[PDB]
RNA sequence: AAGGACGAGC
């Protein structure tokens, strides 16, 4: 478990929040190997966000299942840290409840996706996409969860073995565009 | 949406 699999961005922090209270707070779900509140170099004031890193991906998952999170009188806004290498890429920092899944071919059905994806989180809807004219399966689908974190969690692995296929998953982007 | 670490002349 490389650090980017165990690291959370924390947004919406009180400007009073320090590394200490961030650490105290998040250590109820485990050991932290790193913790920072980001500060303005000139004024030394909190920029309103920080990062925490747990020792195991188990602990991140327990923290994020354990939401919402309040610290210093504010509900904060945690999200899995997108790899630095990915900054500047299209949709890198997008936050969405909907997953694109491609490479599922013409034999994959709602239940195949429901079976595979349900232990990541609560699924609201599964859409297996068909041609409007033929009704043939187009080889891709979308899964919509009740929260963004299953999506964020799922896409840290690019390929998923679903119904005998090595499917690629991505954050669902708007049509719209795209 | 990045300070550190990974990797500062160790």
């Amino acid at each position: 478990e490389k650090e980017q699999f165990r690291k959370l961005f924390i947004g919406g922090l009180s400007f009073e929040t320090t590394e200490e209270s961030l650490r105290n707070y998040y250590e109820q779900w485990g050991k932290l190997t790193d913790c920072v509140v980001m500060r303005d170099p000139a004024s030394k004031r909190s920029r309103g966000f920080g990062f925490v890193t747990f020792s195991s991906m188990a602990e991140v998952d327990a923290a994020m299942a354990a939401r919402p999170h309040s610290i210093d009188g504010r509900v904060v806004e945690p999200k899995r840290a997108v790899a630095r290498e990915e900054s500047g890429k299209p949709g890198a920092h997008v936050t969405v409840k909907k997953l694109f899944v491609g490479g599922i071919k013409e034999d994959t059905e709602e239940h195949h996706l429901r079976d595979y994806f349900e232990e990541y989180g609560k699924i609201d809807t599964i859409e297996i996409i068909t041609d409007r004219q033929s009704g043939k399966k187009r080889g891709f689908g979308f899964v919509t969860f009740d929260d963004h974190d299953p999506v964020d969690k799922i896409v840290l692995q690019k390929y998923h073995t679903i119904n005998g296929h090595n499917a690629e998953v991505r954050k669902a982007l708007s049509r719209q565009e795209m």
Side-chain angles (χ1 to χ4, degrees):
Chain A
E1 285 153 295
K2 230 77 240 157
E3 165 166 297
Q4 79 140 139
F5 296 102
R6 278 178 298 111
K7 187 176 194 177
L8 290 184
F9 177 90
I10 313 289
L13 296 176
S14 170
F15 64 35
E16 308 291 301
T17 297
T18 53
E19 282 140 29
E20 187 188 356
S21 65
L22 196 53
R23 180 174 291 265
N24 184 62
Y25 191 76
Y26 276 104
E27 287 192 315
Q28 68 198 144
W29 295 283
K31 180 204 296 183
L32 297 202
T33 53
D34 186 33
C35 187
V36 68
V37 170
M38 292 290 307
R39 291 185 179 79
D40 183 72
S43 60
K44 284 52 161 48
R45 296 187 29 77
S46 182
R47 291 168 71 193
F49 69 93
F51 294 90
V52 297
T53 309
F54 293 90
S55 59
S56 90
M57 193 180 346
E59 293 164 333
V60 179
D61 296 340
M64 297 297 279
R67 272 179 295 162
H69 296 160
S70 16
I71 316 191
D72 301 307
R74 286 172 60 93
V75 173
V76 298
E77 288 171 20
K79 316 176 272 177
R80 316 211 182 214
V82 180
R84 275 199 193 76
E85 153 191 68
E86 307 298 313
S87 277
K89 282 196 205 181
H93 293 119
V94 141
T95 290
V96 289
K97 298 172 163 182
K98 197 167 174 180
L99 184 77
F100 174 84
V101 183
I104 67 172
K105 303 284 145 56
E106 311 194 50
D107 56 0
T108 313
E109 318 211 276
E110 278 179 20
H111 77 278
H112 291 127
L113 298 196
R114 194 186 310 114
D115 280 0
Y116 180 82
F117 283 118
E118 67 192 344
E119 76 187 324
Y120 291 91
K122 209 293 200 71
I123 300 166
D124 288 332
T125 60
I126 292 158
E127 282 168 81
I128 306 279
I129 298 299
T130 50
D131 184 302
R132 280 216 138 94
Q133 249 80 310
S134 74
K136 152 181 149 126
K137 281 182 218 86
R138 284 179 64 194
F140 68 91
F142 289 91
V143 173
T144 308
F145 293 92
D146 76 338
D147 188 62
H148 69 86
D149 186 64
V151 170
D152 292 328
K153 200 188 165 177
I154 287 163
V155 303
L156 288 176
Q157 198 185 126
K158 181 159 160 150
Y159 301 102
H160 294 257
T161 298
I162 310 178
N163 189 38
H165 301 297
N166 200 48
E168 173 178 5
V169 296
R170 295 155 161 188
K171 283 158 157 182
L173 299 199
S174 78
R175 273 162 203 87
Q176 230 161 77
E177 289 168 76
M178 245 62 220

